[PDB]
Amino acid sequence: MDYVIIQSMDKEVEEILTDIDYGSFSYDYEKNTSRAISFTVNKTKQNAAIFDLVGNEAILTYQGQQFVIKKCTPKSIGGTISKQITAQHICYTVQDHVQYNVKSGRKKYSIQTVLEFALQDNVLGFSYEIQGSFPLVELEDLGNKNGLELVNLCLEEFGAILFADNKKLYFYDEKSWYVRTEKQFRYLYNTEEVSVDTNTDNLKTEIKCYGKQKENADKLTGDNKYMAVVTYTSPNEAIYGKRMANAKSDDKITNNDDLLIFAKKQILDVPETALTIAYKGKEPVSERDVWYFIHEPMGFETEVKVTKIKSSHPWSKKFQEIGFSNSRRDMVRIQTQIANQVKKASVDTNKINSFSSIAMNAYDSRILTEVVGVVDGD
Amino acid sequence: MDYVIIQSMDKEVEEILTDIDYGSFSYDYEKNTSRAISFTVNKTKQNAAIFDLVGNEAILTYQGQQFVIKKCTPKSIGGTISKQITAQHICYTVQDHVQYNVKSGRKKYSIQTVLEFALQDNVLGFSYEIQGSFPLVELEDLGNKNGLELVNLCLEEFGAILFADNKKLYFYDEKSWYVRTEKQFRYLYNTEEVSVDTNTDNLKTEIKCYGKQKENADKLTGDNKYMAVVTYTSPNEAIYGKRMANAKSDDKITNNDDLLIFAKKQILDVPETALTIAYKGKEPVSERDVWYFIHEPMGFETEVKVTKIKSSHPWSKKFQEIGFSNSRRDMVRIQTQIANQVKKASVDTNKINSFSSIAMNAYDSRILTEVVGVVDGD
Amino acid sequence: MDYVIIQSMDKEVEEILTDIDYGSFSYDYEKNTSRAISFTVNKTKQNAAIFDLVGNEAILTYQGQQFVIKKCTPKSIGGTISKQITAQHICYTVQDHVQYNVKSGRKKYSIQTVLEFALQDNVLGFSYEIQGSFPLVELEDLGNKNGLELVNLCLEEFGAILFADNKKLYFYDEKSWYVRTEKQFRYLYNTEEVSVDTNTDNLKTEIKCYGKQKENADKLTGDNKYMAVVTYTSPNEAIYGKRMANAKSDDKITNNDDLLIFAKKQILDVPETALTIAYKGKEPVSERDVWYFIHEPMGFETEVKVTKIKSSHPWSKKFQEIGFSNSRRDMVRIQTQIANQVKKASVDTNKINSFSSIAMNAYDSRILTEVVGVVDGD
Predict the structure, then answer these.
(1) B370 neighbourhood in chain C, CB within 8 Å
(2) Which residues form the Prophage endopeptidase tail N-terminal domain (chains A, B, C) (predicted)?
């Protein structure tokens, strides 16, 4: 059903939210990033009975998917009372479950073990499924995070893609996520505006990396301080020249092959491009289908995998916006990155304060023990 | 008087600033946050004599209150010269006084002692008064800050509200600050637009907290590492379910009741709401009065305490904007929070660098003592 | 020539980029800050042959200067294909060369030595020239940075001004950079809008500074912890009174004269002003010339040195915007400052983690020495 079903916070009453301003309705999806619906509801005679129920923590069913309202803005301008509703997919509500226990130390985990640890003894009825092949990732002191943080960690590390059937989270890989379809994007046929953002500020074709630190680091000079020092040069240098970046240091590995693969992962030697298409066709576009893009004036004839969708209501007459190959820069993204880096630095210095305090604790005890030993020497 | 009195930086000449664009005039107040007036002045024949005096560091008297100009923007477009004046209440100028001395160590202070320490030997003629009851707060190495920083620390810790009669700062509590009044806000009578912003992204009802660390922490497992470990569950869970938050750690307390009250203070279990009212009545609204709000279509019949005012000049014909129950999100607030967190992290790293260096300094002397004892043993 | 010359990434074909939307063309310069050109190109018959060549990493010659394209935005709206081109001066491409070697320790360098170290064994054909006199600056572990970072460090430390003839970077000082000219800015003659931004939020006339830390810091009390403690008071206090700021600590000097000069450098005792002029005269304005500003209504009769230019194409009919005495506040600058402070804090904590681990590592050797001595004494 294309209409919205409203279920109250206490789940006592469930009805149909009518007279929604479908022109303002919008559904936003971005892989591993967001899944939400936003609209505006005006209080009229048809929905006056249930207009008081729509609020924060209410549930909206739309196209078989459940969204929890996370921001409600009632507004009264004369005779019109309007609520601006924003609801996120119920999967993100898994952040309300926190795994306090910590698996201390460095250990090689798989996606299955981390997912089982994250969603152990859930009280919100959350379940997970895995469909694909993923490598092993070594992690330090896993735990002490909420469910959403651990899910995001899994997505970032194992390179998985998460999609939720209400409260059941499926984790695919790149191979099993995208499905090929015969639907295609054609210039002048079903597309209006096509934009390509290309950036080459981080185009680097050379990198130098250092491994762990030798015990006699002070006694040694130069790259001899590390058992693993490697310089990686990308083949793209042949078309871009030598563009070397600032050195990155990993202090957890000792051999050279791991350093080489890490250095290869540490740079980006292809121009960063983001594609945006304004689509106004009749065929619906899902979150998994791969389309064929043909646009002669822009010199495009390829296969495009959808990574971002900004759809309107089917009755809203508006266009659809579809993204490929990551998203445009945007400023709030930069602010979020800075904020998370700040949080990481804050927790790091909080840990280092305790570490330095204990550095005095282990000092005096052994001082006393060996001073007693020295007295025994006398 | 409703007009503005301009006194020069050197206080040689004090006159009346006329021909002020009262339509652009605005007075902004927010409790413990801001108190300022902003407007625009055009150079005309009436104020040509004193138009050169209005500038940075000049004093403006408005309704018996003194504001120091902190931002002046002269602008020339043909024959019209305009200055955009922004002035902050003179109380904030107390930030020009810095208390360099530090009361090192952890100690339980009252508001009176901290206020006396902050404004000791002032050369700007600042005085303070306290009206209310406040608890005792334990602080570390109080001092080495300007007057405004210590005042903000007092406001944040003791839960006081600061209001300034020019250069005399009164510190009230919630009980003695708000005064009940018979004035009321009525829908369709003196209000035009009413907005309520509701957020439930921090709705948490369960928290786990850890106390100090035991001396034999490394040889202990789990919560045994701390003498104080407690899980606090809010009653609101009965209407919201279990929503665990990330664990918060306090390393300065040992018992369980203090950790319980700290954990209770550490979460927020009600929807975060902010109310904004556009008022166009004849009765003026002050910064302390508590009104009665009645708005049937939005289901309001309560008492509202003013926390933010954006008033216009009495001749400006414009509406007034009044806020209750904290303010809307906004980005500049987020940027200020991020900046202050960055500064705190930077100073923490600066202190910890010296701490590690003196750990190396306290190292070698004790190594020398050990060597002396070793030689004595032989 | 006033038109744009386009040279492909592979330098195979070099032609003239015609049908450029000169109305959108803009050239932005700011001393030690930026040098770039931005415009928009529409695909027409006159340039359809070479419209595919203009893209990222292409080279544009404009008025004898080379700019590398760093952001290209092809766009298709119906029958018009447009590319939004932003190109930075080729000098900044020197950031593609990284000096991995580090000159560890604290040492007094000159500008010549640092510049030679930065551009040693360049593969991009970069050369440097120095014209002026600069003092000696002491630095720690110079190196491990790209060319642009070291150039910016030189500009910030030695107080130099960088101007590039394509790939040849000239470094002047204040004396040899600005050249006096007879061209003047006159009110009502060749200027339209003149704006002055004045801020006095950081107006401080007193500061207290502490030198290095004594070895018996814990055994000593107060300012005796430092061999160098000095309070600097600016003469401008006579116009503004005492406005003392938060104390700044330098832990690398021991005498009092260096602390005094550092404290003098640490505060600003004059209002921070920024001047902007809209110029519409026939005489072109360069990046070095010093003009004479006369504006009676705003009380200006002085010499103004250009620090920022926003010029249009000579055929664009638009005004020119010229800045003096630093630039307006803006937010993106604040975000850049916050981001670089975050990066500095991150590298500081990354270094101090290894430092603390070494402190733990350095403990075990001395524990072994104590044990051996205890055994020997017995």
Answers:
(1) 366, 369-370, 373
(2) 4-89
* Helix ranges (DSSP H) in chain A: 111-118, 147-158, 174-177, 237-240, 256-265, 331-377
Q: Which of 18-57 (C) contact B at CB < 8 A?
A: none
Please enumerate in sequence order all residues whose Cβ is within 8 A of that of B282, keeping only pairs 6 or more positions apart, or say none: none
Q: How far is CA B339 from CA A294, B347, C340, C342, C347, in A?
A: 47, 12, 12, 10, 18
Closest CA to A19 of A97, A81, A110, A61: A81
Cα angle B325, B327, B329; round to 5: 135
Burial string for C344-370 (b: 16+ CB within 10 Å, else e) reads ebbebbeebbebbeebeeebeebbeeb
Pair of tokens at residue C8: 């492909």
Q: Which residues contact B278 (CB under 8 A, 6 or more apart)?
A: B191, B192, B193, B194, B319, B320, B321
Residue type, B139: L
Residues 271-300 of B with CB under 8 A from A: 271, 295, 297-299
Contacts of A315 (CB under 8 A, 6+ apart): A2, A22
Three-class secondary structure of residue B133 per DSSP = coil
Residue B354: both structure tokens together:
């010296």
Which amino acid belongs to residue C309? I
Amino acid at A361: N
The residue with tokens 């918060």 is B248
Interface touch A76/B194, C-beta < 8 Å: yes
Q: What is the β-pairing status of strands B168-172 and B127-131?
A: parallel
Are A242 and C96 inside 8 Å of each other by CB? Answer: yes
Residues of B whose CB is below 8 A from C298: 74, 76, 81
Residue A45 DSSP SS3? coil
Read off the DSSP letter of residue C20.
B
Cβ neighbour number for residue B269 with a 10 Å cutoff: 20
Experimental technique of record: cryo-EM
Q: Which residues in A lie closer than 8 A to residue C339 (C-beta atoms)?
A: 334, 338
* Nearest-angstrom CA–CA distance, B170 and B127: 9
Classified as helix, coil or strand, A293 is strand
Contact indicator for B198, B271 with CB cutoff of 8 Å: yes
Q: How far is B158 from chain A (nearest CA, A)?
A: 25
In whole angstroms, how far apart are CA C209 and each of B93, B135, B347, C229? 22, 35, 16, 6
